[PDB]
Amino acid sequence: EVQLVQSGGGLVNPGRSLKLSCAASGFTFSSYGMSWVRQTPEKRLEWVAAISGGGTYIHYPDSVKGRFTISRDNAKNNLYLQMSSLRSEDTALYYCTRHPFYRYDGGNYYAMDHWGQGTSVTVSAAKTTPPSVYPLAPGSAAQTNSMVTLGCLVKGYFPEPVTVTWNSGSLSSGVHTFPAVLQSDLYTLSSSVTVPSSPRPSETVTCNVAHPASSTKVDKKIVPRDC
């Protein structure tokens, strides 16, 4: 128990606003101080706001002071972060975290002993564009083995993320999903799968892509064919 779950993250233009939520469970919420922490793409951890078991005594780093507001609802057991005046640099994963039992033992410290899963917030002017799904089949010419490799290119989409499964989640082993790379405001991602060269054209290999942002969903058969 002691579960924290963030929601509300998404694509925002620079200058717009977003409101994040964090649901607590497994504890008596009003007895604990919580904080918001953001992880940046270059993998750094930065603290952005603290809030007490009862409300009062909100703390901010100089950077956030004036744009973000940390709120709680001790009733509905929800922590909030209201972001405003957003700018590109606020792009990152936001995590809600809780601090150890808060007592008036004459001022003490604050560790973060439980953390959320994060919500992603992207500040960008780029527009939502769904992906193009292309099948990568190998040339039935003269491979080297008992195993054949197959792929799918997910191209030209915005923003992240996309979900890519093989055979609807069935084909689990021999999958490599490569991290998306952003170029000219659109991301491109690839996924590869290695299956035995017997179940080849015989058994159908399909890659399932979903890009929630565009509410897009493509099912693309590959069957290791003669090109």
Partner: protein, 214 residues
């Protein structure tokens, strides 16, 4: 504003070796130092409370030591479950600050990539574009050099690479290399080559295809 300076930044270890991660502080901050562990695709975890005092359910293998400007996290035998990023955080004074991070990697034997090359889809081709893709699979160490050659001459223009993080199964890395051409420039050259130069060999591993079809 405290500065926490973490050393080393990167570090490869043989499962078995003890390691020491340092977290220096620009100021005092006595025991107000805490250490977190973040595995791949997971959230940070509390490990060491006040640079000595662990939490629980954590191995005894992890030791937190220090007071003042220098604090250290000791990991006595390195195990596969143990590789990820390690962060120190100071609670002493607001604004709470963290240190850059100490990435740990599993040093394994060297391994040659299995490369496969893929011509543009005929689906892609309608839309006027051609992406030629090479996968460089399960190699170690990470540093690999990939070059595109069109009819023999090196092509720099239009390439986008993507490396995976270290695998949890066997400690390898993977990589996708994409070259993007227009159908027009694609229908004007004959041979597509992708050459990978890795530690593992003196000769570049090369995989090619000739355009042609049906």
């Amino acid at each position: 504003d405290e500065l926490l300076t973490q050393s080393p930044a990167t570090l490869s270890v043989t499962p078995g070796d003890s390691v020491s991660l340092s977290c220096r502080a620009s100021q005092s901050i006595s025991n107000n130092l805490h250490w977190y562990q973040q595995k791949s695709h997971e959230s940070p975890r509390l490990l060491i409370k006040y640079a000595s005092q662990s939490i629980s359910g954590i191995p005894s293998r992890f030791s937190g030591s220090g007071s003042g400007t220098d604090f250290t996290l000791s990991i006595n035998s390195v195990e596969t479950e143990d590789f990820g990023m390690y962060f120190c955080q100071q609670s002493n004074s607001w604004p709470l600050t963290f240190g850059g991070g100490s990435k740990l990697e599993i040093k394994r034997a060297d391994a040659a990539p299995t490369v496969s090359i893929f011509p543009p889809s005929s689906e892609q081709l309608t839309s006027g574009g051609a992406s030629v893709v090479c996968f460089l699979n399960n190699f170690y160490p990470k540093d690999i050099n990939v070059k595109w050659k069109i009819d023999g001459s090196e092509r720099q223009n239009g390439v986008l690479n993507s490396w995976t993080d270290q695998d949890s199964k066997d400690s390898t890395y993977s990589m996708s290399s994409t070259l993007t051409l227009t159908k027009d420039e694609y229908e004007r050259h004959n041979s597509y080559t992708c050459e990978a130069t890795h530690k593992t060999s003196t000769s570049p591993i090369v995989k090619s295809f000739n355009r042609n079809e049906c």
